[PDB]
Amino acid sequence: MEPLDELDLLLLEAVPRVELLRKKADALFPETVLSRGVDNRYLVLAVETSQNERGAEEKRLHVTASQDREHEVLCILRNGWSSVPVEPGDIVHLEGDCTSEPWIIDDDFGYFILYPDMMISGTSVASSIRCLRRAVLSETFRGSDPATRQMLIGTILHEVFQKAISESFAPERLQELALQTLREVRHLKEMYRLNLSQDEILCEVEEYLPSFSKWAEDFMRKGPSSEFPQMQLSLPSDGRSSPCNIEVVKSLDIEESIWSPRFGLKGKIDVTVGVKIHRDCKMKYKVMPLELKTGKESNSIEHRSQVVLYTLLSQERREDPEAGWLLYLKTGQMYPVPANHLDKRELLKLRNWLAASLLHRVSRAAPGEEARLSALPQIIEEEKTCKYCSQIGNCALYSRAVEEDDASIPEAMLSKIQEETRHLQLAHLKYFSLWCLMLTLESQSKDNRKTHQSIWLTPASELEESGNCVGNLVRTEPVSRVCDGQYLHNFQRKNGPMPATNLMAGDRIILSGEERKLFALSKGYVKKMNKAAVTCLLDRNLSTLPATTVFRLDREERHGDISTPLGNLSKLMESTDPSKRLRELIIDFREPQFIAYLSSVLPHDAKDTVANILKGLNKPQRQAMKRVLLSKDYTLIVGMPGTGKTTTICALVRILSACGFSVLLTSYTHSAVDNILLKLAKFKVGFLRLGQSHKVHPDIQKFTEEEICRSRSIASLAHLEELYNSHPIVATTCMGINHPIFSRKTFDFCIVDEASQISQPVCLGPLFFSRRFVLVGDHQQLPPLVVNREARALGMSESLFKRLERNESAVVQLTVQYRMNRKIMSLSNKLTYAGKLECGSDRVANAVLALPNLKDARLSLQLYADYSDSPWLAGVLEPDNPVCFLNTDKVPAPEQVENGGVSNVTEARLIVFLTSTFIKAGCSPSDIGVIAPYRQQLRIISDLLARSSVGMVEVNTVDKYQGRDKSLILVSFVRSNEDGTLGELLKDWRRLNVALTRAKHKLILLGSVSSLKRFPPLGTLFDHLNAEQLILDLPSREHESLSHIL
Ligand SMILES: Nc1ncnc2c1ncn2[C@@H]1O[C@H](COP(=O)(O)OP(=O)(O)O)[C@@H](O)[C@H]1O
Ligand code: SF4
């Protein structure tokens, strides 16, 4: 903007601007429908402040509930509402009634719900009264309130009381309930975690119990209504003065789980109760929310506010209860909490700021330029609140790693921040700060930002046709229990039939009812799947309204996955000796040490056993074992394809075991960890498997903590502790580091399988409990998946394995492979592994595809085709031609583009033929893998294969094929285009590599050389394929052979 002239012409003034905001809201809230009435969703278009009275702020909002940009509705926020931080492009909901006419919301009328699909927990909202920062930090570093003793006592009491209210408050029965519940594995675990006495906890819990009885005698007495406790309860309901008499009749519901699209609130109502309010000689009956509190009898604002929010939650399910109850089990003293409009308003205003703070996490600085982490809500001046925070750790830490001549942040706190973060170096802070930034961006990616609107706005049918919304279902079969909050249910349709789609038994599913009034309820996972019925395990028992009730099941999306990574990052920053050690080895790249071999590096007694184990192993394997044994810090085992990383890890574990080391065995997937374990079972090496026995492989389930417990009926801290110390080897996944075992045990060694696939901050986790570690991986194979472009660009896809690989001292390669025949090996060897792979034997080397009856299959195919078009088919089927590229050039084989995805029906039809041929040539479908790069193309190939009713071969992307192999791999590359649209995906070297290494005996590759050559990995492949003349050009679709397929 120089000349007079630019200024002139740079004067704008609506249409691209309005549309750019629709894009803006779609970034964070994809597919927000926009609506009128009860569940209104309005898109903000314009925001300004004005002056009424004199010096009185108003906020002038221009909003729309429709996409046609002439449906503009005006809106004025007054008093405290005017200060809510709405910018344009936000999605809002006016719960202050209306939509009929929004106009004015102020002190005395209306609620404004900023980012309504963002359902924040009321407890976090209450927390933020005192400190908004503390709340945000709570929401995001979820583990930095460690489980205290009181929290344990707290849970136990809540639970006893819930059990009591459905039964009796008679002291012997309360004592019984206390006795039973103190023995539940769940609580034993926590006692274990906290190294507490079982009996001491029992004792402490027992002292509360007479209060339980006093309360029940007071309120649940069944006498004259004169004689119930007497208090003022000023409701909406007309007349609100004069005392009245309170009778709790029954508990109606316990742990009522409520999600509010209306207020952007979620909550769990401890106990829902039937209450009779007695008024002179008349009575009113109200279903009301009661919160149990295990601390001091504070009647704090936090505590009351909580209950106020529970009243709002309630409206999602029933009539507005107007008030709620605080119990304080310590004393048996119930307090009324009335939902005043002032409260409901004050809290919902504060709730907005919380939603804003949790959403406005990455800053541009110039709408388009590189990312920053947005600074959190500022540090308070209330130096008393601070004192006892626990979040102070992360607060000081977030401050120092992301802050700003200034500060002017309280100087009694400015020193605490330094005490807390004096142990850390600049590198460390930089590392923390970046890893958050990356994680946040990843978390905020559009894909993992879908709202629950599908569940509560569009009904059952419209959604079942795809994705997952199975829903016209009733239950009648009695609900079984399993343990605590894992109830087994059984559902099927009204009247008769009805379908399936993408709803595979194992899936995370959310179970709502029919009507909007029964949304949320219970969440869980699927057990089995008939097309007559559906069994799933849930956290809630669901009796309350039988028969009449229709239920919808739906899918899900986390992203708040980022809690675990964030945890590990926070733990890394702690000043403990293990965290220092990891800081230096990881952040500071301190060189790992290895000692030189001596006679007694191993316990004398281990040596025969170790020598035997070694003698089983190929040389680089032995070299690997040596490096681990000589390690002082860590070892990196490179598991090149087919080299037997599962056989190797088992061997290491056997050697370490023989040496009298404790080993923590971890991986990314349950499958991978279980595979190693299955091998170890054979060798009769003992181990305990942590994790959920349904996610654990069938034959390992016997070794599970879950199974062992139920099996051997473990009902004492000592017997649980016995099980925990029963095995030197403990096996879990990288995510399962939250187990109470890691509160109390450390290990000589941690081993991480698939270290190269696991995201770096996740991989970090099990290491905190290990003295020396071993990462197993191959960076030539797939990296951790990083969806967000920008994040990927900052280094987010660098596995911990690769990071540490820059110390070659620590790296040992597994190079002798047992998967590929020399021809198939030769490929990946020339392309990727710089000639380092060798065959495990001549057997492996010379193996060609098992095809028992080519003879009559070659004939049956000539019943339409030709023998004079042997060019390809003969070269394709010939087992002695193990590598083969089929060029879809002289037949046109065009790609089709449909909404983000790519397909190719020519290639699809082509491989489906080839598959059918090879099964008919005697290769079983089980031994066959189909690989395509495009999600969309896989669908087409599955369909076409079902059409040919040969369905037993798997079609998939490389991801779902890592460290598995098939005897015959077939690859449709799908890209085939005029000379334009060029993938990002095919450009990837590693993905190609995985594709070329899944095949044992026959590899078949199919795509258009013309367009494929434009991708470097493919370009180079074509070069090596030309040297051996392995490209075979397909004839025209006209030609006799192809004609009948197309
Ligand atoms: N040192 C070795 N000597 C002989 N065969 C081996 C050796 N290491 C691995 N193998 C073979 O290689 C194959 C691959 O190992 P396996 O653990 O079954 O799957 P993967 O290692 O590919 O996960 C096995 O069938 C195994 O017999
Ligand atoms: S420490 Fe004080 S300021 Fe930092 S979060 Fe906790 S409360 Fe808010």
Author numbering: 1 to 13, 20 to 245, 248 to 412, 415 to 1056
What did the study's authors say about this model?
Dna2 has nuclease and helicase activities and plays key roles in maintaining genomic integrity. It is involved in the nucleolytic processing of 5’ flaps during Okazaki fragment maturation, of DNA double-strand breaks (DSBs) during homologous-recombination mediated repair, and of stalled replication forks in the intra-S-phase checkpoint. Dna2 contains a PD-(D/E)XK superfamily nuclease motif and a 5’ to 3’ helicase domain. It is a ssDNA endonuclease that requires a free end for cleavage, and does not cleave dsDNA, single-stranded gaps, D-loops or RNA.
The structure consists of a ∼310 residue domain that contains the PD-(D/E)XK nuclease motif, followed by a ∼450 residue, C-terminal helicase domain that has two RecA-like folds characteristic of the SF1 helicase subfamily (domains 1A and 2A). In addition, the structure reveals an OB (oligonucleotide/oligosaccharide-binding) fold domain N-terminal to the nuclease domain, and a β barrel domain that occurs between the nuclease and helicase domains and which is held in place by a stalk of two long alpha helices. The base of the cylinder is formed by the nuclease domain, which adopts a doughnut-like structure with the active site embedded in the central tunnel. The β barrel and helicase 1A domains pack on top of the nuclease doughnut and extend the cylinder and central tunnel. The helicase 2A domain, which packs with the 1A domain as in the ADP states of other SF1 helicase structures, hangs over the tunnel opening at the top of the cylinder. The OB domain decorates the exterior of the nuclease domain, and is uninvolved in DNA binding. In particular, both proteins have a β–α–α N-terminal extension and an α–α C-terminal extension that are stapled together by the iron-sulfur cluster.
